[PDB]
Design a protein around this motif. Structure first.
Motif, PDB file in Angstrom:
ATOM      1  N   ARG A  52       0.837  -1.197   0.000  1.00  0.00           N
ATOM      2  CA  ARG A  52       0.000   0.000   0.000  1.00  0.00           C
ATOM      3  C   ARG A  52       0.869   1.242   0.000  1.00  0.00           C
ATOM      4  O   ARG A  52       1.705   1.420   0.884  1.00  0.00           O
ATOM      5  CB  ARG A  52      -0.917   0.013   1.226  1.00  0.00           C
ATOM      6  CG  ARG A  52      -1.835  -1.198   1.310  1.00  0.00           C
ATOM      7  CD  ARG A  52      -2.684  -1.182   2.573  1.00  0.00           C
ATOM      8  NE  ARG A  52      -3.552  -2.357   2.644  1.00  0.00           N
ATOM      9  CZ  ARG A  52      -4.111  -2.806   3.765  1.00  0.00           C
ATOM     10  NH1 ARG A  52      -3.904  -2.178   4.916  1.00  0.00           N
ATOM     11  NH2 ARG A  52      -4.885  -3.885   3.737  1.00  0.00           N
ATOM     12  N   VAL A  53       0.667   2.112  -0.985  1.00  0.00           N
ATOM     13  CA  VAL A  53       1.393   3.371  -1.003  1.00  0.00           C
ATOM     14  C   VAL A  53       0.384   4.485  -1.227  1.00  0.00           C
ATOM     15  O   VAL A  53       0.316   5.058  -2.318  1.00  0.00           O
ATOM     16  CB  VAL A  53       2.472   3.411  -2.104  1.00  0.00           C
ATOM     17  CG1 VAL A  53       3.362   4.635  -1.915  1.00  0.00           C
ATOM     18  CG2 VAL A  53       3.330   2.147  -2.059  1.00  0.00           C
ATOM     19  N   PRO A  54      -0.404   4.801  -0.192  1.00  0.00           N
ATOM     20  CA  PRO A  54      -1.381   5.886  -0.346  1.00  0.00           C
ATOM     21  C   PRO A  54      -0.644   7.211  -0.506  1.00  0.00           C
ATOM     22  O   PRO A  54       0.451   7.364   0.036  1.00  0.00           O
ATOM     23  CB  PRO A  54      -2.186   5.838   0.954  1.00  0.00           C
ATOM     24  CG  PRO A  54      -1.310   5.130   1.944  1.00  0.00           C
ATOM     25  CD  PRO A  54      -0.426   4.200   1.155  1.00  0.00           C
ATOM     26  N   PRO A  55      -1.231   8.168  -1.241  1.00  0.00           N
ATOM     27  CA  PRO A  55      -2.571   8.125  -1.824  1.00  0.00           C
ATOM     28  C   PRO A  55      -2.585   7.622  -3.256  1.00  0.00           C
ATOM     29  O   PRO A  55      -3.549   7.899  -3.970  1.00  0.00           O
ATOM     30  CB  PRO A  55      -3.001   9.593  -1.779  1.00  0.00           C
ATOM     31  CG  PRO A  55      -1.704  10.329  -2.076  1.00  0.00           C
ATOM     32  CD  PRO A  55      -0.612   9.498  -1.399  1.00  0.00           C
ATOM     33  N   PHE A  56      -1.551   6.892  -3.667  1.00  0.00           N
ATOM     34  CA  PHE A  56      -1.350   6.638  -5.092  1.00  0.00           C
ATOM     35  C   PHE A  56      -1.721   5.249  -5.597  1.00  0.00           C
ATOM     36  O   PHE A  56      -2.225   5.119  -6.708  1.00  0.00           O
ATOM     37  CB  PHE A  56       0.111   6.917  -5.447  1.00  0.00           C
ATOM     38  CG  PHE A  56       0.530   8.339  -5.183  1.00  0.00           C
ATOM     39  CD1 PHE A  56      -0.076   9.390  -5.854  1.00  0.00           C
ATOM     40  CD2 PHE A  56       1.509   8.623  -4.247  1.00  0.00           C
ATOM     41  CE1 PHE A  56       0.303  10.697  -5.603  1.00  0.00           C
ATOM     42  CE2 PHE A  56       1.889   9.929  -3.993  1.00  0.00           C
ATOM     43  CZ  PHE A  56       1.288  10.963  -4.677  1.00  0.00           C
TER      44      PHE A  56
END
Length: 119
Positions: A52-56
């Motif tokens: 998970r690499v928010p917001p991307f």
């Protein structure tokens, strides 16, 4: 695809090497994060680990069973810059300390498949 991944990474590479250089526009950062994350998902296809690499972006990788009910799911979560440093090999996940949040018995296996692009 691999060409476009390289182009997107190239556009932010100076700033990855030296954060004193100009900050990327959000669109540039987003594309580098998304294409490198998707590259990982192609390199080790599966659904055992979620990155998970928010917001991307969020991707899934690494083949194997679905985690046991009552146990932590396998998740790797970090910020866009740290992710790109991992993806490009400028940082080893083993050295990333608390900048990378990990849960589950297999999360650390993403290390076997990084970097996905070198610069």
């Amino acid at each position: 695809d691999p060409a476009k991944t390289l182009e997107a990474v190239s556009a932010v590479a100076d700033w990855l090497r030296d954060p004193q250089r100009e900050s990327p526009a959000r669109a540039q950062l987003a594309e580098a994060v998304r294409l490198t994350a998707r590259t990982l998902a192609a390199v080790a296809p599966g659904a055992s680990v979620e990155v998970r690499v928010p917001p991307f972006v969020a991707v899934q990788c690494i083949s194997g069973p679905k985690h046991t009910r009552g146990t932590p799911p396998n998740v790797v979560e970090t910020d866009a810059r740290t992710w790109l440093l991992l993806a490009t090999g400028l940082l080893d996940i083993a050295d990333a300390g608390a900048s990378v949040q990990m849960s589950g018995s297999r999360a650390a296996e993403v290390a076997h498949w990084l970097p996905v692009v070198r610069i």
